[PDB]
A and B are shown apart, each in its own frame.
With several copies, the nearest count.
Chain A
């Protein structure tokens, strides 16, 4: 039970890159509810999206998160300067326990 996502994902502005976080132990889906949180440095992390496709009220539509393939991942389309900061992945399992990913940043060039 260890969340897996790639720490390195740098995209130049105007480019959409996909971030994929999965689980080593087992394949993911809606039952193992995924979520995406940006943590802007100097501030508390804010939920980018939740339960796959649904997008949080605050968040922009430039990046869309969906479960593609075995492991669900966010798919940012045409990334821009603002959206970039440390990200974390987390999927709910069992009762009251969540496992977070290692974290990933991304950078405009």
Chain B
């Protein structure tokens, strides 16, 4: 329309309406020029990765993309506290994305000084992939998300993808995607861009902790009419075998018949947060649980949903089982235990097997006059008919959705790092600065990004008499208010926040 007239306004606010929520967030961004506008092959041999498990083939592209996939982009900590305390379930509904206030800059850098000037006739290419024809990188929980604090200015990440390989060399089945082949809407300093999206139907993420454990469902005061095998002998001696049956009842509750059994387990190694208890050897890679695919061993992370620790022991955690977040300012390499935030799953200990414990025992052989009855510990257990399980909780820092791989079959597609599985997630948004002349001008753009997601809720119906556990901030004085900036203007979040406080009956 024009250079001198604003192409959009600032929107940050949240309307809490009935059973629905609308969260609007707006950020300011800067997009540089990557690879001098070139599509460059990459591999492990370019970076120098020696090992075989790390071998990869792929391309790096000049295009950038927008990642809002993390929760804290949309939900401020005060909205989150209102959400997790009052609500059993939630899930996205609609997605509105506006891109405006495009400002393109040009740079001429002399020997000692660089002069930053505007460029009025330059353009910025952008498009959305609604056909899901490009590789989808938003499901790996990468950095580069919109920052949690509205006044932060963030840098658009570079878009790349990987494909088939054998060693560091590609194969004839690998694919190369030149994003130029896609139509894109070009924007000058006056144009704006918007689109809408409809989240496909997905189940409400469970946001509650079970009041009743799975092994305690049966009524306490009444005997069952089912019998169990109490005694296989009368006493010490020769040829004392006998069969004696007893009633399953409150006196012995472990042997009663039950209609449902806990979910699957794949045993993680148990690492203790008190270092004097850990074995004195390097077992970080050697003892880790991992699934092997095409001869390349990939660590199991985070793995199936399982309780992190037994009741009463909070100092242990599965070696690769639990999601780990860095604190503000945490270094990139070799940070000690107090620079990272560890998420314990103990809410699901009711219906899910403990990750560091065996799922149970199974009978190895037939007993007889010669052979005693023997058993062995079950390390892994697949799904059996009649298992119930709780998925992994979602966190304020955690990812929201992932794209279900397109395959013949899948089971309970809900992703393992948490959130909502979808066959058609919110599309990727690819943006770049159009090259203005292989000698080009130093150029970058900036502007505004506003993402809006309508959320649906499920209200708390419970009749529980005594008060619920709620998420609250401790009253004791501190030198810095949690979820705020310090004296230098550095916004940090003190602890990872779970979504499960309110309780339900099992």
A residues in contact (CB < 8 Å) with B: 53-54, 61, 93-96
A57 to chain B, nearest CB (A): 12
- Residue in chain B with minimal CB distance to A95: B372
Provide the residues of chain A in CB contact with B370, threshold 8 Å: 61, 93-95
Q: How far is the CB of B335 from chain A (nearest CB, A)?
A: 28
Asked whether any CB of chain A lies closer than 8 Å to the CB of B239, the reply is no
Which residues of B lie under 8 Å from residue A94 when comparing CB positions? 370-371
CB-CB under 8 A from A96, the residues of chain B are 372
Closest to B374 in A: A54
Query: Could you tell me which residues of chain B, from 370 to 391, have a CB within 8 Å of some CB in chain A?
Result: 370-372, 374
Residues of A within 8 A of B279 (CB): 95
Give complex CA distance A37, B279 in Å: 26
A94–B372 Cα gap in the complex (Å)?
7
Shortest beta-carbon distance from A3 to chain B in Å:
16
Q: Interface size on B (CB < 8 Å)?
A: 6
Number of A-B contacts (CB under 8 A): 12
| A/B interface sample: 12 pairs, CB < 8 A | A53-B372, A54-B374, A61-B370, A93-B370, A94-B370, A94-B371, A95-B279, A95-B281, A95-B370, A95-B371, A95-B372, A96-B372
Residue of B nearest to A54 (CB): B374
User: Which residue of B has the minimal Cβ distance to A94?
Assistant: B370
* List of A residues within 8 angstroms of B374 by Cβ: 54
Cα-based distance from A95 to B281 in the complex (angstroms): 10
- B371: nearest residue on chain A (CB-CB)? A95
In addition to A53-B372, A95-B370, A95-B371, 9 A-B residue pairs with Cβ atoms within 8 Å of each other are A54-B374, A61-B370, A93-B370, A94-B370, A94-B371, A95-B279, A95-B281, A95-B372, A96-B372
Which 5 A-B pairs give the minimum distances between C-beta atoms? A95-B372, A94-B370, A95-B371, A53-B372, A93-B370
- Measured between alpha carbons, how far is A17 from B279 in the docked complex, in Å? 23
Residues of B within 8 A of A54 (CB): 374
Which residues of B are found within 8 Å of A53, using beta-carbon distances? 372
Q: How distant is the Cα of A72 from the Cα of B279 in the complex, in angstroms?
A: 21
User: In the complex the two chains form, what is the Cα distance from A53 to B286 in whole Å?
Assistant: 14
Q: In the complex, what residues of A have CB within 8 A of residue B281's CB?
A: 95
Measured in the bound complex, the distance between the Cα atoms of B370 and A94 in whole Å is 4
> Distance in Å from the Cβ of B285 to the closest Cβ of chain A?
16
Smallest Cβ-Cβ distance to B372: which chain A residue = A95
User: Whole-angstrom distance between the alpha carbons of A2 and B281 in the complex?
Assistant: 24
Complex CA gap A61/B372 in Å reads: 13
Q: Mark B279-316, 1 if CB is under 8 A from A, else 0.
A: 10100000000000000000000000000000000000
Residue-wise, chain B 108-145 has the 8 Å CB interface mask toward A (1 for contact) of 00000000000000000000000000000000000000
A95 to B282, CA, bound (A): 13
Complex CA–CA separation, A90 to B196 (angstroms) = 71
Closest-CB distance, B279 to chain A (whole angstroms): 7
Chain B hits for A95, CB < 8 A: 279, 281, 370-372
Interface string of B452-479 (1 = CB under 8 A from A): 0000000000000000000000000000
| A88 to B410 CA separation, bound complex (whole angstroms) | 53
Q: Which residues of A contact B371 (CB under 8 A)?
A: 94-95
**Chain B residues within an 8 Å CB radius of A61:** 370
Of A53, A54, A95, the most chain B CB neighbours within 10 A belong to: A95
Q: Which residue of chain A is the closest to B373 with respect to CB atoms?
A: A95
| Nearest-CB residue, chain A, relative to B370 | A94
List chain A residues, Cβ under 8 A from B372. 53, 95-96
In the assembled complex, the CB of A107 is this many whole angstroms from the nearest CB of chain B, namely 28
How many Å lie between the Cα of A61 and that of B374 in the bound state? 17
Measured CB to CB, the nearest residue on chain A to B280 is A95
Q: How far is the CB of A27 from chain B (nearest CB, A)?
A: 15
